[PDB]
Design a binder for this molecule. Structure first.
Ligand SMILES: [Cl-]
Ligand SMILES: [Cl-]
Ligand SMILES: [Cl-]
Ligand SMILES: [Cl-]
Ligand SMILES: [Cl-]
Ligand SMILES: [Cl-]
Ligand SMILES: [Cl-]
Ligand code: NA
Length: 129
């Protein structure tokens, strides 16, 4: 599924991400825009052989099982395919674990390089929330 900006803001708000670990909803929408262009089916292979899955590009080295990342963990206890669903529940639930892990939203490279310290409120401007 390719979400609309406001549609995804609403979905993320409903799943408890607004101000989760102190990050406002615009941070999560910005991260999704630059990681996946709001496409739940996005995948990207890493040089190390791990793969990033779904709207928040969650990596198989730590967070999900794809059966082809040797020596990896599955800290979210999910198949990585669950992260590609039109239903963002599994992505959101795993993102809450990640953002709790110690480096906050710096875990997301696109967030650090393209969202951090910008006017992220612009990402939810005009949305009925
Ligand atoms: Cl947009
Ligand atoms: Cl915001
Ligand atoms: Cl594996
Ligand atoms: Cl594990
Ligand atoms: Cl699995
Ligand atoms: Cl959803
Ligand atoms: Cl933090
Ligand atoms: Na894994």
């Amino acid at each position: 599924k390719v979400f609309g900006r406001c549609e995804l803001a609403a979905a993320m708000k409903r799943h408890g991400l607004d101000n989760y670990r102190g990050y406002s909803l615009g941070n999560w929408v910005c991260a999704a825009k630059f990681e996946s262009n709001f496409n739940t089916q996005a995948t990207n292979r890493n040089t190390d052989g791990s793969t990033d899955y779904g709207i928040l590009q969650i990596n198989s080295r730590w967070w999900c099982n794809d059966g082809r990342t040797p020596g990896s963990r599955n800290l979210c206890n999910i198949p990585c395919s669950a992260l590609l669903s039109s239903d963002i529940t599994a992505s959101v639930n795993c993102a809450k674990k990640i953002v709790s892990d110690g480096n906050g939203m710096n875990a997301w490279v696109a967030w650090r390089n393209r969202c951090k310290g910008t006017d992220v409120q612009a990402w939810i401007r005009g949305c009925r929330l």
